[PDB]
Design a protein around this ligand. Structure first.
Ligand SMILES: O=C(O)C(=O)C[C@]1(C(=O)O)C=C[C@@H](O)C=C1
Ligand SMILES: O=C(O)C(=O)C[C@]1(C(=O)O)C=C[C@@H](O)C=C1
Ligand SMILES: O=C(O)C(=O)C[C@]1(C(=O)O)C=C[C@@H](O)C=C1
Ligand SMILES: O=C(O)C(=O)C[C@]1(C(=O)O)C=C[C@@H](O)C=C1
Ligand SMILES: [Mn+2]
Ligand SMILES: [Mn+2]
Lengths: 340, 352, 352, 340
């Protein structure tokens, strides 16, 4: 039975959106032409006098529904864009044979921080036995308290490369400054951007410019819109090898470190066609939730799950209470293995 | 520059074409809002938006990147949404647009929202006659007319003190008469509304009950000032709409109280949202108070926050006083003893 | 290394001295908790903490920086606080520690929390016999026993459809009998609890009423399963404590429903908190459901989220179905039409 | 009348805290000694085998109240600190005669972004006439959307220095990367760290190492604890010239861009003895709230208020809807001036 009149009103709106689309772009072309003319004379692209003059035209005789302040905002967005302009199936990221976003489901495992060769070695052996190809380790660790461990740094990356080769593993690590992006290309297989750096644009650029998979974590308090925009930044600069990781978001809830937002996954999968992972360790911040949340994450259709393993977590240098020991890790794997 | 002028000429011609389509779009959107408002469907539809943005994306060949156009078009949809929201707010009895002049609530001679600034003071919970008596004496000496006390207390634990209940209301009426005070208390269920009319001068609805709609209705149906506290996690829109439930039932004697909102921040019990005050004062014609004790949850902030609240133009400030807070049965760490209260008063005497 | 050993020997000796003081400290803290729990004062006192940290700061000459010691001592105070919190949780009737074995609620043959997984399905609001009839037929064909419908609807606007009320409950009872279904509905005020017993099989408390304590009590006092939805902005602690109000009154037939929580995120009506489920299942002995329709507020997420919810070990999933959602009087964009529902069922058939 | 027994229990607890304080520090000394011994042999500071051995001792016969997992966490914090260790009246910041945190109340004013000489000049003239010494401008602007303006950069700093000299003003600007810290010393009087960079530790260090006032904005979603820790980082590295700015925090509320947290001010003032400012423009995100919120902020005892002014905001390149035009600014000043 339905609503004939709502549909037709919406039809009309759509039909207007296309008319708008066409005009904005013809406007675009004209703007390009103008830039060429201006730039030839060596005249600045941005003209606030000209903008004000155009806004005055828009503002005259406004008896449409909107406030004038509002219209000007709309038209201002248009002029911004004009200025900036003067100057679909699923993405796959192969890393060492893993075709992430193949539709299959991958696991990343390894210690929070890299602390020694023998440390990481211990883990690598254990994970390889679990048929995991993707290992992750913190060569650099972003550090909120004053007695936190910053990372071994390059010595870290060396250790990972060593392990990578030795054990036939793809190895993943966070990098924290544009300088170090370049350096890491030689040691690691995927570069991670931590959540605190989701809006470190310098770094994003830097990563946008290499031939390397990027693992971009969603910010502590980032909207999805924002997260997407950060990814599009990397891509817009050449690098389309991007994996998104949900890792929880910050809420009033104290039972959990962060609040895991599984809704994000299908949404991100739908709106970008990048693969999306979930970090069960840093979202919950709780050993007891790791397994359940992994399942959840698989069910909902994440491309992979990421968690942290360390041979003696009680003495680790980061995340003592969050990491799985190797026993805990094997139990964990048996149980999501049985997610069949 | 002959050619730059002539290019701008044409751009102008387009801006008008755009202007006209944006506005026609506006109108259709209003038509939709009316439908949505009738049938009670949420104003904001992200599934719908993404469907519209996919068409834009399926039909873009022009020069601008798709991510960029989508940004532009979102700003349009935002504005379309705000148009609807402002359209519904226009017609509410709680808005200034409906009732421009600002509402006054007389209680025992206090003309709240007259432009002056009033204080509500008293213990969190009513525990005994003598307890409240103690406080009342102290406050009266500070020229305060408005006393508040918890006849009923909503509680996180059911094993925590729930209130003396009616015995509570009796004690307050007694004090009211004895001390010539207007006396305020929270009531928690529609049944008890009726009963309280005999004892107290303003009925408070606690934050946890902001969306207990039956209680609202019940309160909407009496001849009594209501003091409506904003919910733990309520948008302003919502808070306003709860005030609408009350006015819609006949009662327009409503005072809004900001009392903080819930955030990730642990240093403070809640996060006091001072922005709300001038907003509520702009968007409605009701007086607005602030509860400094429950928002901060901290003795050390009571004073500062009161000043802040006066400065920003609150119609009043509300706080909690109790003769021995160490043994109080609620808010033992938050309440002012009588000394603390007199220090507090001397210091905000100086902010009107 | 002769000297390293002998230095470590001494460090060990200190670790024990520390161990012993930390524990004695623990005990004193428990003693304080008992006092605080008696008199109903908040467990966490930042003013108190800062007073303690100032002493540490006023007396530090040893080698460690003050900012560093304070960090250590905070971790101690955290643990002292958690000790109290876990002490109070121990003794609640809602905890596993009290009632280790897990609670079962039989409703019309469904043994909820038996370990199997149940589905609740039906329209947001009850609008007509034929409306609900339509849905009931469809769900029964999907082997579902548990039907839910809104006899009363809490609403942001008082001008939005509030519910048919009793006529609603009548319609549901009719359907229940006609179709051999257990039928669920929200009730919104203590008065109406009593009345509903005759019509429906489970009483729901909406999220906005999680801290409507009178309603809780009212529900605590009947022989009826209760479906308690977690508040918009409720901590887990709180949600559990609201379930305590009910059990404390006699009724232990309680089902907890997660239905999202409120966050800065606008893409979703609320943010579904899947973490809660296994937590609630660990910390209490009650079954836990998820409402996928109200948490996401999005047709496109209904399926995924259901799977997620089953996987994580929810005792059930609850969603909304309506024969023409475009004209529904609530949730027009959220509800599944019957096709959508059958697609939905075929796909989660495959997750138990 | 009171609670004699609660007081005495608390007394006892305090008396224990001091006993703990004394032992942790004697432990500290011993640890220092050990480091010297280890480092002489050229042995790594961190010994996970040794830590596990100590944790096993702690864990044996636990019939105190705490779980073992918990005790180990406590003791782990202690060992962390021991490892890191191997290796009060109010602060005043003079800038160009302003004795910020003098107890008086200062204003910072100026445009969001620096766009041209004449632009900033326009503003500077207007503010100087309002007796303001502190001018702020965005040489670098951190940039969430893809058509946002990044800043003129150095050309920006030059322009500010020019204005500073010309108009006898102290001039403030955000800097976004450690490299640029050094450069800016020559152009500006206070360096701002934006909120998105509150936990960019690289940058903090860099700023911790200069002789320059720093204006540190609190992060989008930062606890107070975190904000403080970021400040202590700068200080711990030499620079104690720090001004904290509250600028709102991110909440579910859509009527306001962010939610202004005035509670923070007195708290920060109490807990650090740094001056604290409030940014009324970026917290509310609303022209209509600027004035009220300024008052609030003054009342509550902020050391200063910061807001944004621009000669034609409708055409500005950032914050079009938030900035005050010069009229609006004068009205604004008259009204907080009348905060007497
Ligand atoms: O007309 C011009 O001078 C342009 O560069 C184009 C345009 C426009 O969008 O029209 C855009 C940016 C300028 O600041 C002014 C206007
Ligand atoms: O078509 C609708 O559903 C509308 O209300 C219109 C509209 C728009 O089209 O702007 C506005 C807000 C909604 O969130 C979706 C789209
Ligand atoms: O003395 C108190 O108020 C306590 O409950 C003890 C204690 C502690 O001392 O750990 C713990 C929690 C409070 O937030 C403050 C301090
Ligand atoms: O005993 C040692 O070897 C130390 O360096 C001291 C210490 C301790 O804190 O005892 C701290 C860190 C080391 O990882 C082991 C223990
Ligand atoms: Mn980690
Ligand atoms: Mn700005």
């Amino acid at each position: 039975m339905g609503n004939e009149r709502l549909d037709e009103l919406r039809a009309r709106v759509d039909e207007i959106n296309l008319q708008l689309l066409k005009l904005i772009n013809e406007r675009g072309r004209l703007v390009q032409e103008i830039g060429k003319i201006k730039e030839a004379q060596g005249t600045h692209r941005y003209d606030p006098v000209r903008e004000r003059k155009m806004l005055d035209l828009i503002s005259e005789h406004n008896d449409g529904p909107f406030e004038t302040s509002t219209l000007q905002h709309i038209f201002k967005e248009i002029f911004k864009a004009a200025l900036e302009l003067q100057e679909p199936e699923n993405t796959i990221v192969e890393v060492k044979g893993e075709r992430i976003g193949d539709g299959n489901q991958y696991f990343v495992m390894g210690p929070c921080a890299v602390e020694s060769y023998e440390q990481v070695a211990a883990v690598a052996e254990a994970v390889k036995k679990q048929g995991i190809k993707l290992l992750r380790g913190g060569a650099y660790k972003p550090r909120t308290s004053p007695y936190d461990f910053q990372g071994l740094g390059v010595e870290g990356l060396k250790i990972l490369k060593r392990i990578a080769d030795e054990f036939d593993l793809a190895v993943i690590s966070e990098i924290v400054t544009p300088a170090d992006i370049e350096i890491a290309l030689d040691y690691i297989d995927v570069i991670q951007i931590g959540a605190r750096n989701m809006q470190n644009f310098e770094l994003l650029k830097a990563a946008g410019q290499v031939n390397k998979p990027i693992l971009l974590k969603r910010g502590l308090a980032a909207t999805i819109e924002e997260f997407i925009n950060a990814a599009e930044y990397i891509m817009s600069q050449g690098n389309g090898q991007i994996i998104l990781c949900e890792r929880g978001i910050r809420t009033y809830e104290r039972a959990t470190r962060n609040t895991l937002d599984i809704s994000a996954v299908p949404i991100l999968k739908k709106e970008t066609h990048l693969p999306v992972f979930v970090d069960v360790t840093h979202s919950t911040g709780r050993r007891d939730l790791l397994i359940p949340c992994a399942k959840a994450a698989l069910a909902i259709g994440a491309d992979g799950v990421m968690a942290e393993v360390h041979p003696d977590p009680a003495v680790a240098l980061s995340d003592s209470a969050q990491q799985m020991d190797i026993a805990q890790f094997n139990e964990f794997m048996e149980e999501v293995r049985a997610f069949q």
